[PDB]
């Protein structure tokens, strides 16, 4: 199965927290389906899940905090987590859930236990709790010998995490490096991605970098030119 | 959360589980790479999803006294990642908690020297009243570096924000620094060098304007 998440990518302390996940491939309503978070510094959180009845049930440590549901009709898992503070910065992962029994005796007195395992799992979104807002980030091209060049796009000054960057989006899909990017004294971050290019494809051909800023939300392109 | 294991390339890792069941378990072990999605290695104490390389391993719950373990022979650079035990067991109650990731740390790959690409401010930037400098250091190991700014022939001790290494999709470090100048300053100096030490030597690269 495949799946997605989406989100705020901001929001201020004491409001509410809003991530959605789309599953593809797999029919929503024949399963369980969970959320686990990662924050700075700590490790993966589980926050609770859904059974295919549509019942809930969550984490103690969450404080009732959070509230889990599906949309069949849109095939989308959601959650939203309430009354947030700068703790609740994390990345946001949904996953799928299976139950398996551990019987070690005789069932009517009660000698099994359950447990879930999740298997399939998403990649995460980046959710952060700021006082601040989304600042777009201004791109510069950074222009271009071992028969190669180097290309690359300044992205500067954005917040908060992440970025996306895209070149051509699939034709130049290397050898290009987009880097990890840095978190400057201001508290912006700017990253840059570069690509090698040939000189002799320089002045022929044309690149471009996509940089995607979701929670800005910002879009923009830049050709890069010598 | 974190506990570190380091182990040399090649051998075989053994990774305890944090908690020792009370009563018979069920354990999961998942493995997490910074930046992308956690995954199910071993499910059920010793079960491994299909598509998981035979090379990691649990241990069976025999009913002897025997903690649970993960076992991955052959360590690769690639096994470098987060590792969690998610303990089930019968007089401990449904476990909200993964635990603590053991962050394993391969060594002993061989030594690489860095690609080093400097670029000076774009044209746009000076017409935006900044300019900034941008040393990109990669395809190095070990991980340390020194990165140094010089302005002609003495070293900026400002103005430069410098990323701490990572690994990256080719695990070799990678690491940006950025030496933010105004245009009268750039227009300054005859010119500017990023300088970069590994492993004892240096290398260096340098732009002026233009």
């Known amino acids: 199965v495949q799946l997605q998440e989406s989100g705020p990518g901001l929001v201020r302390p004491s409001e509410t927290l809003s991530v959605t996940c789309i599953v593809s491939?797999?029919?929503?309503?024949?399963?369980?389906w969970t959320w686990i978070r990662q924050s700075p510094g700590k490790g993966l959180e589980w926050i609770g899940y859904?059974?295919?009845?549509?019942?809930?049930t969550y984490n103690p440590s969450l404080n009732s905090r959070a509230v889990i549901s599906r949309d069949t009709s849109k095939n989308q898992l959601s959650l939203q987590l309430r009354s947030v503070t700068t703790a609740d910065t994390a990345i946001y992962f949904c996953?799928?859930?299976?139950?398996?029994?551990?019987?070690?005796?005789?069932?009517?007195?009660?000698?099994?236990?359950?447990?879930?395992?999740?298997?399939?799992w998403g990649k995460g979104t980046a959710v952060t709790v700021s006082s601040a807002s989304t600042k777009g980030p201004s791109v510069f091209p950074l222009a271009p010998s071992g028969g190669t060049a180097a290309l690359g796009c300044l992205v500067k000054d954005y917040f908060p995490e992440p970025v996306t960057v895209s070149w051509n989006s699939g034709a130049l899909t290397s050898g290009v490096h987009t880097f990890p990017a840095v978190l400057q004294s201001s508290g912006l971050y700017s990253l840059s991605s570069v690509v090698t290019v040939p000189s002799s494809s320089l002045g022929t051909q044309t690149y471009i970098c996509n940089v995607n800023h979701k929670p800005s939300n910002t879009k923009v392109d830049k050709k890069v030119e010598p | 959360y974190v506990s570190p294991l380091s182990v040399a390339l090649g051998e075989t890792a053994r990774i305890s589980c944090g908690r020792q069941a009370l009563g018979s378990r069920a354990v999961q072990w998942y493995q997490h790479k910074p930046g992308q999605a956690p995954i199910l290695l071993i499910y059920n104490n010793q079960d491994r999803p299909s598509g998981i390389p035979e090379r990691f391993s649990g241990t069976p719950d025999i009913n002897f006294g025997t903690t649970a373990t993960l076992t991955i022979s052959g360590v690769e650079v690639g096994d470098e990642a987060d590792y969690y035990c998610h303990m089930w067991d019968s007089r401990s109650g449904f476990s909200w908690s993964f635990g603590g990731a053991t962050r394993l740390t391969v060594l002993s790959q061989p030594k690489a020297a860095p690609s080093v690409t400097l670029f000076p401010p774009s044209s746009e930037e000076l017409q935006a009243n900044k300019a900034t400098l941008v040393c990109l250091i990669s395809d190095f190991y070990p991980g340390a570096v020194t990165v140094a700014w010089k302005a002609d022939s003495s070293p900026v001790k400002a103005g430069v924000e410098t990323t701490t290494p990572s690994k990256q999709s080719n695990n070799k470090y990678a690491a940006s620094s950025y030496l933010s100048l105004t245009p009268e300053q750039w227009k300054s100096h005859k010119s500017y060098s990023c300088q970069v030490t590994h492993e004892g030597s240096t290398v260096e690269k340098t732009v002026a304007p233009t």
């Open positions: 859904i059974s295919d009845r549509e019942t809930t």
């Open positions: 491939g797999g029919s929503i309503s024949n399963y369980y």
């Open positions: 996953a799928t859930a299976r139950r398996g029994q551990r019987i070690y005796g005789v069932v009517s007195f009660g000698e099994f236990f359950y447990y879930y395992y999740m298997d399939v």
